[PDB]
Every structure is written in C-alpha cells, then in structure tokens.
Amino acid sequence: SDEADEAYSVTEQLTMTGINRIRQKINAHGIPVYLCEACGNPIPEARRKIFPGVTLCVECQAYQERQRKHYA
Template sequence: MSDEADEAYSATEQLTMTGINRIRQKINAHGIPVYLCEACGNPVPEARQKIFPGVALCVECQAYQENKIREKQIQALNDAHSVKER
C-alpha cells in the first residue's frame, strides 16, 4: 500500500514541478510575463493576449488546430452518411 502512496506522491510532485517550470519559462528576466505558443514556442502577440486572456496558441497554430478539428468533423459526417447509404 505504501508503494502506491509513494508512487502517487511522486507523480503529484512531478506534475507540480512541471507546472512551476512552465510558469517560470513564461516570465522573462525582468519579471514580465512572456506568453509562448504551446505548439510552436513562438511568442503570442500582446494584442492576442489582451483579447483572449490565457491564450495558449499563436494565431497560426490555433488556425491549424481548428482546421484539423473541422477536417475530422467533416470526415465523421461523411463516414456516418456513407454508413446510412449501405
């Protein structure tokens, strides 16, 4: 039982440290937050941050992600439609 508790504690500690390190990476040497795209690592423009507080992706990566989602939705609709026709 203590092994499971130790593993759970270690996993929690690791997740906490990962979160702390992510926050540290988002703050420059002057203590000013620098928001980087979680997909490509490029800076997220300040104007985008103001419009969408907490934004995680730059415009290009957000558009790419949305296009991928749309493609999957269209494919699912096409698959469902082809099943109905059979």
C-alpha cells in the first residue's frame, strides 16, 4: 500500500471527477435554438458556432453565473 499509493488513488478520483463535471457542463452537441431563452434576443452567430446549443446570450449567461457564484 505504501501510504502514497492510496493517496494516488484518492488524487486520481478527485481530479477525474472534477474534470468530468467541468466537461459535462459544456453540452457541445445540441439544438440550434437561435434565440435567447431569457430575453429572446438574437444569440449572435459566433456564440452559437463556438457553443453549439447555447440557451442564453452572454449577458444573461454572465448574470446567471453571478447568482450561481454566490449560491441558490
């Protein structure tokens, strides 16, 4: 066991679970929505080409990010 091999397993699980959470948050494959689900605005072309399947424009997205930063 050596006490660093188990530490290795712990670190491996920690990094992998973090990596895959931050990957699942991407949702690359998606739907062409074409209009914001918050303000109905035109989600500009470049943002839909970068993130296929967005649901918020950058303004509503950053807004939501602030709140989910604090919590709730």
